Amino acid sequence: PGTHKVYVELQELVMDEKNQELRWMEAARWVQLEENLGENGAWGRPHLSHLTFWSLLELRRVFTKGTVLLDLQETSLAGVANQLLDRFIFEDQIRPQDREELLRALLLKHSHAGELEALGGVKPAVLTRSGDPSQPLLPQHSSLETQLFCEQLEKIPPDSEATLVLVGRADFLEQPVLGFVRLQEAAELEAVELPVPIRFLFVLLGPEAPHIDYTQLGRAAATLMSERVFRIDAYMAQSRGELLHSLEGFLDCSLVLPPTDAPSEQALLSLVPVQRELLRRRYQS
Amino acid sequence: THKVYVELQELVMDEKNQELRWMEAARWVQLEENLGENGAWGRPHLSHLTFWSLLELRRVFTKGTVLLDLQETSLAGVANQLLDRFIFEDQIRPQDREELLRALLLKHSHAGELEALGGVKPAVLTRSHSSLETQLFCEQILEKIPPDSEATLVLVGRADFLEQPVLGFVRLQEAAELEAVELPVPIRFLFVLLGPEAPHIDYTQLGRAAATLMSERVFRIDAYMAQSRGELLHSLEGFLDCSLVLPPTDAPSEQALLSLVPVQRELLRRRYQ
């Protein structure tokens, strides 16, 4: 009752091919393991969530100055978006001119995998000063997980609550912004098709910047939400400082594996004690 | 192109005489080997890195002091030019120059001499917990080094009088066999990481990150043909692009690490092409 297991969904602002109207569509989901959604429309193989260094860099940077709304007494996604944008303006995260377009982007239709066969496809999109969507200026890199696992719901616990992670690109925004919202009571939103109530909202919006991949940033946020210690801390957090402390503990026990010319598959096994001790340090203090 | 042998040395004190000196801490030939207490080299292992180590390595490399094709054959001249360029780039004050020169010119001890010293303890420079790798690999060379190999020396120290952490990257015009520091192969690259006590900075981890960076073939080639600090920075950004982070997870360790094999093989496909 105090804490629940968390199902995480990552959704990205994308362009559909048939009508060229930008819409929210899920890209990956976390039920104790990450499943990615390919271009064909079938979920890939579940796998352990590996994070890039830059994604964790940017997650820490946007979380340090991030906006958090804890125990927010609201039930609808529109009201939550209104409150988050008001707190964004209060914290100088966004300018008041950005509010109308950010709101109009937040209540777009949240689609799922079932619409991929109906629609022509999905393409990455960037939201402009007006309502028009654009083609991203920075070079496009295909998703690594899509290239690895994609190309070829009964596991959800009954008392689990959902977490929605929304990543979007907006060229008119001055800097990337983080929005973390914990609802006072878990509420069923139209954003998630599943009958799992929503407790947490992750909103990561920003302009195109070097070393910032918003898909990878959303993956890092979702992996952090799927971590047991951070999940408990987010449930019990009463301020942004507790979330930041949990994130520092998360990064202290993260294992960074640098490039090496010879992947032997046996020198990798030499880091089993390292992984065990890092998990011990994460679980103890 | 040359094969590398990286050597990490740290500023320490000896119990018997309380004298500051540079002590062997780890070496890189093909995998990382750490020196623990009692003077026994640990098991060879993959050079895993911490998030904060690579963080601060990038931070101090961005403001790094880079000397390339330096025409010196002794450690004293390299140190003199390095602190002169430190003063020129305003990394350190001119008053700390004498003390830093005194520190960089202390005796460089090695594995064989550790037992005769009656122990070695970590030290911090004044102006006047055990390592994870030791805990997990050390509780229990010339043949391996290729003939046409050149060595890298990573010098790591703590100096409270310094205001900020300072990185100095020196590349020699010709490989030199320094008399002060004895190595099986001549020194070419010289990493100098100094600074005060600061949050999220473990200087052992900074030196390990620098040594792992220098052991990487692509960065080694780039530093061989680098002509400015920007090229080194770009190679470091590519290194971090290919860097993979494993978050703390409850999966079984063997399967958890084996899942990273295809991710690594894809992540390094165009790096070595």
CB-based contact, A266 to chain B, within 8 Å: no
For A273, nearest residue in chain B (alpha carbons): B136
Does the distance separating the beta carbons of A56 and B212 come in below 8 Å? Answer: no
A110-111 vs A22-30, strand pairing mode: parallel
Does the distance separating the beta carbons of B259 and A47 come in below 8 Å? Answer: yes
Number of domains composing chain B: 1
Residue A277 burial class via C-beta count within 10 angstroms: exposed 0-12, middle 13-18, buried 19 and up:
middle
Rounded CA separation A80/A86 (Å): 10
> Going along chain A, which residue ranges are E strands?
6-16, 22-30, 34-36, 51-52, 67-72, 110-111, 122-124, 126-127, 133-134, 161-169, 177-187, 198-206, 255-257
Dmax of chain B from CA atoms? 54
Are the beta carbons of A227 and B236 closer than 8 angstroms?
no
Short-list B95, B103, B127, CA closest to B19: B103
Signed CA dihedral, A103, A107, A110, A116: sign only: negative
Rounded CA separation B59/B51 (Å): 12
CB-based contact, B250 to chain A, within 8 Å: yes
Rounded CA separation B207/B9 (Å): 8
List, in sequence order, every residue forming a beta bridge with B76; answer none if it has no partner.
none
CB-based contact, A113 to chain B, within 8 Å: no
Give whole-number Cα distances, A98 to A67, A86, A170, A267, in Å.
16, 11, 10, 50
Nearest-neighbour CA in chain B from A264: distance (Å): 9
Does the distance separating the beta carbons of B245 and A259 come in below 8 Å? Answer: no
Minimum-distance CB partner of A268 among B46, B54, B136: B46
Name the residue type at position B49. Answer: L
Rounded CA separation B31/A268 (Å): 11
Short-list B20, B22, B66, B46, CA closest to B264: B46
Rounded CA separation A269/B135 (Å): 17
Give whole-number Cα distances, B96 to B61, B83, B107, B147, B194, in Å.
21, 9, 20, 40, 12
Are the beta carbons of A87 and A12 closer than 8 angstroms?
no
Name the residue type at position A107. Answer: L
Are the beta carbons of A164 and A11 closer than 8 angstroms?
yes
Instruction: Select from B4, B34, B51, B234 the residue whose CB has the most chain A CBs within 10 Å, as the one to mutate to test that interface.
Output: B51
Instruction: Give the determination technique.
Output: cryo-EM
Of the CA atoms within 13 Å of residue A75, those in its CB half-sphere come to 1
For B103-129, letters b (16+ CB in 10 Å) and e give: bbeeebbbeebbeebeebebbebeeee
Give whole-number Cα distances, B218 to A39, A89, B186, in Å.
33, 45, 21
Rounded CA separation A186/A192 (Å): 13
Minimum-distance CB partner of A48 among B213, B217, B251: B251
The resolution of the experimental structure, rounded to one decimal in Å, is 3.0
Q: Residue A80 CB: number of other CB atoms within 10 A?
A: 24
Name the residue type at position B123. Answer: A
Q: Residue A78 CB: number of other CB atoms within 10 A?
A: 13
Does the distance separating the beta carbons of B271 and A144 come in below 8 Å? Answer: no
| Set of chain B residues whose Cβ sits within 8 Å of the Cβ of A229 | 248
**If you write DSSP's letter for every residue of chain B in order, what string do you get?**
--EEEEEEEEEEEETTT--EEEEEEEEESSSEEEB-TTS-B---B---B-HHHHHHHHHHHHT-EEEEEE---SHHHHHHHHHHHHHHTTSS-GGGHHHHHHHHTS-B--STTTGGGT-EEE--B------HHHHHHS---TTTS-TTEEEEEEEE--BTT-SS-EEEEEEEEEEE--SSS--SS-EEEEEEEE----TT--HHHHHHHHHHHHHSHHHHHHHHS--SHHHHHHHHHHHHHS-EEE----S-HHHHHHTHHHHHHHHTTTT--
CB-based contact, A45 to chain B, within 8 Å: no
Signed CA dihedral, A193, A194, A199, A205: sign only: negative
| Set of chain A residues whose Cβ sits within 8 Å of the Cβ of B218 | 259
Rounded CA separation A258/A276 (Å): 19
CB-based contact, B72 to chain A, within 8 Å: no
Residue B2 burial class via C-beta count within 10 angstroms: exposed 0-12, middle 13-18, buried 19 and up:
middle
A133-134 vs A126-127, strand pairing mode: antiparallel
| Set of chain A residues whose Cβ sits within 8 Å of the Cβ of B246 | 48, 50-51, 254-257, 275
Structure tokens at A216: 């990878």
CB-based contact, A271 to chain B, within 8 Å: yes
Rounded CA separation A180/A200 (Å): 7
Does the distance separating the beta carbons of B243 and A224 come in below 8 Å? Answer: no
CA terminus-to-terminus distance, chain A: 24
Strand, helix or coil for residue A150: helix
Number of H helices, E strands in chain A: 9, 13
Short-list A268, A236, A114, CA closest to B45: A268
Residue listed under structure tokens 């777009």 = A108
DSSP state of A269: G
Length of chain B, in residues: 273
Domain holding A254, by residue range, is 1-285
Rounded CA separation A173/A153 (Å): 36
Minimum-distance CB partner of A53 among B218, B240, B265: B240
Strand, helix or coil for residue A71: strand
Strand, helix or coil for residue A102: helix
